[PDB]
A = this chain, B = another copy of it.
Amino acid sequence: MKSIGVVRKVDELGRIVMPIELRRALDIAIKDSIEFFVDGDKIILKKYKPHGVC
């Protein structure tokens, strides 16, 4: 349980379902963009257009 409190299960490759809350968080309309940043063990998802830490 977290802020979103949702855990996903990798398909088989690594594909999972990100929440509308992620689409809402960033800017995602139907595909838009989500680029990830790895931190220690964790993964950081953010849209491409909004330049953040990289």
Which residues of chain A have a CB within 8 Å of any CB of chain B? 1-23, 25-26, 28, 30-48, 50, 52, 54
Decide: B17 and A14 in contact? CB cutoff 8 A.
Answer: yes
Q: Could you tell me the distance between the alpha carbons of A13 and B38 in the complex, rounded to whole angstroms?
A: 24
Copies of this chain, tallied across the complex: 2
Residues of B within 8 A of A41 (CB): 25-26, 46-47, 50, 52
Residues of B within 8 A of A23 (CB): 10, 14
Residues of B within 8 A of A20 (CB): 13-14
Q: How far is the CB of A50 from chain B (nearest CB, A)?
A: 7
Residues of B within 8 A of A32 (CB): 9-10
Residues of B within 8 A of A17 (CB): 13-16
